[PDB]
Design an enzyme around this catalytic site. Structure first.
Site, mmCIF file in Angstrom:
data_model
loop_
_atom_site.group_PDB
_atom_site.id
_atom_site.type_symbol
_atom_site.label_atom_id
_atom_site.label_comp_id
_atom_site.label_asym_id
_atom_site.label_seq_id
_atom_site.Cartn_x
_atom_site.Cartn_y
_atom_site.Cartn_z
ATOM 1 N N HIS A 231 44.713 35.969 51.965
ATOM 2 C CA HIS A 231 46.048 35.811 51.299
ATOM 3 C C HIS A 231 46.848 34.726 52.017
ATOM 4 C CE1 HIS A 231 45.020 40.186 50.783
ATOM 5 N NE2 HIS A 231 45.016 39.696 49.570
ATOM 6 N N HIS B 9 52.948 34.073 59.760
ATOM 7 C CA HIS B 9 52.121 33.471 58.745
ATOM 8 C C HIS B 9 53.047 32.589 57.896
ATOM 9 C CE1 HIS B 9 53.944 37.013 56.939
ATOM 10 N NE2 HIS B 9 53.998 36.263 55.839
ATOM 11 N N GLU C 270 59.081 31.316 49.291
ATOM 12 C CA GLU C 270 59.341 32.591 48.625
ATOM 13 C C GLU C 270 60.789 32.746 48.358
ATOM 14 O OE1 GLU C 270 56.938 35.629 50.832
ATOM 15 O OE2 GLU C 270 55.670 35.289 49.126
ATOM 16 N N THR D 177 56.789 40.976 51.085
ATOM 17 C CA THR D 177 56.605 40.120 49.923
ATOM 18 C C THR D 177 55.191 40.163 49.375
ATOM 19 O OG1 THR D 177 56.119 38.102 51.076
ATOM 20 C CG2 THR D 177 58.487 38.587 50.591
HETATM 21 N N1 LIG Z 1 54.133 42.905 57.693
HETATM 22 C C1 LIG Z 1 54.071 41.917 56.759
HETATM 23 C C2 LIG Z 1 52.848 41.813 56.107
HETATM 24 C C3 LIG Z 1 52.678 40.831 55.156
HETATM 25 C C4 LIG Z 1 53.799 40.105 54.868
HETATM 26 C C5 LIG Z 1 54.948 40.344 55.479
HETATM 27 C C6 LIG Z 1 55.190 41.219 56.449
HETATM 28 S S1 LIG Z 1 56.171 39.297 54.893
HETATM 29 O O1 LIG Z 1 56.755 38.628 56.070
HETATM 30 O O2 LIG Z 1 57.098 40.039 54.059
HETATM 31 N N2 LIG Z 1 55.252 38.332 53.984
HETATM 32 C C7 LIG Z 1 54.003 38.929 53.960
HETATM 33 O O3 LIG Z 1 53.015 38.488 53.439
HETATM 34 ZN ZN LIG Z 2 55.271 36.411 54.328
#
Ligand SMILES: Nc1ccc2c(c1)S(=O)(=O)NC2=O
Ligand SMILES: [Zn+2]
Length: 256
Positions: free
Chosen positions: A60, A90, A102, A194
């Site tokens: 992802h 990330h 986003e 998200t």
């Molecule tokens: N603990 C998380 C796991 C995945 C994600 C996030 C936090 S996020 O920063 O909301 N954006 C994400 O993808």
């Molecule tokens: Zn994120």
């Protein structure tokens, strides 16, 4: 779940009904609706002792993971009560420089968005924190395409080694301070993860000032793959959830 037509954001609510919940992220930050809160304290970003471990393509995005077994890289202050510990960062990015973030700012999309994920140490570990309404603090930083960001280049350079889902590489001694803009002025609001499971556990802290990365840097993000080794190549681009309705929430600004 993923980002394509057939399993992307518009579909996620079927497996994750909270997708249509009361505090979902991301949102559009309407800068002229946000309330300046002269009582929000400065943000404290204490990354001196950060211990990076590994970088992982999860199918992802890619995650840079930290040792969070002690208070070593922490976020405090601003809208936060207590101490939140860095676990991972990330990004989210686009197929084109005109999309990828986003959050949006007055409907403006940035080329990408960095998320530094922290968990509230009152809850003991990340997994318990995500069950709580104040469990996480995510520091979100926009990326625009211009000058190169030298503090990003170590990341860019290791991407070739994690091209496909499930690949990881040692990633030690990476200093996330190199990814921060000069100003720590921010907007903040209560939201969610998200990506699935879209849990409503996040205090978002979104910096006003973007960082600049080069076109060449973001192009290398776009060479990653959503698929695993040996499968048909599906480029890891447009891994962003679009803005969700603000509903009954207020965005606060740390600045006028
Ligand atoms: N603990 C998380 C796991 C995945 C994600 C996030 C936090 S996020 O920063 O909301 N954006 C994400 O993808
Ligand atoms: Zn994120």
């Amino acid at each position: 779940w993923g980002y394509g037509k057939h399993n992307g954001p518009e579909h996620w609510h079927k497996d994750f009904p909270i997708a249509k919940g009361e505090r979902q992220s991301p949102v559009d930050i309407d800068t002229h609706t946000a309330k300046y809160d002269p009582s929000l304290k400065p943000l404290s970003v204490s990354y001196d002792q950060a211990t990076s471990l590994r970088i992982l393509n999860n199918g992802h995005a890619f995650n840079v993971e930290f040792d969070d077994s002690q208070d070593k890289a922490v976020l405090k202050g601003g809208p936060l009560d207590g101490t939140y510990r860095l676990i991972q960062f990330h990004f989210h990015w686009g197929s084109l420089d005109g999309q990828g973030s986003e959050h949006t700012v007055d409907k403006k999309k940035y080329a990408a968005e960095l998320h530094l994920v922290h968990w509230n140490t009152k809850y003991g570990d990340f997994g318990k924190a995500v069950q709580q309404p104040d469990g996480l603090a995510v520091l979100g930083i926009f990326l625009k395409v211009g000058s190169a960001k030298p503090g990003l280049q170590k990341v860019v350079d290791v991407l070739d080694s994690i091209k496909t889902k499930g690949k990881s590489a040692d990633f030690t001694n990476f200093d996330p301070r190199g990814l921060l803009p000069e100003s720590l002025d921010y907007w903040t609001y209560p939201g969610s993860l998200t990506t699935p499971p879209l849990l409503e556990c996040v205090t978002w802290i979104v910096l006003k000032e973007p960082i600049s990365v080069s076109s060449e840097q973001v192009l290398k993000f776009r060479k990653l793959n959503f698929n695993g080794e040996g499968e048909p190549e599906e480029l890891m681009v447009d891994n962003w959830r679009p803005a969700q309705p603000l509903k009954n929430r207020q965005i606060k600004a740390s600045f006028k």
